[PDB]
Amino acid sequence: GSMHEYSVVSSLIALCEEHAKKNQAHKIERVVVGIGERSAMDKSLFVSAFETFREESLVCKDAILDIVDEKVELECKDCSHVFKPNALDYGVCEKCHSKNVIITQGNEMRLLSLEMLAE
Ligand SMILES: [Zn+2]
């Protein structure tokens, strides 16, 4: 198969290393991530992979990864409105009476911010 489960991992750790040389920090303190509550991904599995590959780079080993549990949000296609998943039978858009809405937040993870220690 393919190591797609380590793509996100390798990417983030490389980004940490590339920021720390550019800011001339040569360390990290924290990283902060947002995992949507409908992505069904194990936060424990993702961090355990990040902590495993951490050893690739000396600046990376002094860090911790903080997972924010993120909410779900429903956007409308050709419209101008956004709401929370609640109704079903009458679960149409508030402006336009159709169920054409999509998940803009809740299915997908992203990085939120990073931190570095000067000392
Ligand atoms: Zn709409």
Curated annotation (Swiss-Prot):
What effect on the protein does mutating residue 4 to A have, as reported in its record? Cannot bind nickel. Lacks hydrogenase activity and has only 2% of the urease activity
Superkingdom per UniProt: Bacteria
What do we know about how this protein assembles, alone or with others? Answer: Monomer and homodimer. Forms a complex with HypB.
GO terms, biological process: protein maturation; protein modification process
Name the species this protein comes from. Helicobacter pylori (strain ATCC 700392 / 26695) (Campylobacter pylori)
The similarity comment for this entry is: Belongs to the HypA/HybF family.
Which GO terms of the molecular function aspect are on file?
nickel cation binding; zinc ion binding
Q: Which InterPro entries match?
A: Hydgase_Ni_incorp_HypA/HybF_CS, HypA/HybF
> Disruption effect?
Mutant has negligible hydrogenase activity and is severely impaired in urease activity.
Q: Which Gene3D superfamilies does this UniProt record tie to the protein?
A: 3.30.2320.80
Quick one: which gene encodes this?
hypA
**PROSITE patterns the UniProt entry points to:** HYPA (PS01249)
Which function does this protein serve?
Answer: Involved in the maturation of [NiFe] hydrogenases. Required for nickel insertion into the metal center of the hydrogenase. Is also required for urease maturation.
Q: What is this protein called?
A: Hydrogenase/urease maturation factor HypA
Chain sites annotated for binding Zn(2+): 76, 79, 93, 96
Q: Which UniProt keywords apply?
A: Metal-binding, Nickel, Zinc
Task: Tell me the residue numbers annotated for binding Ni(2+).
Answer: 4-5, 42
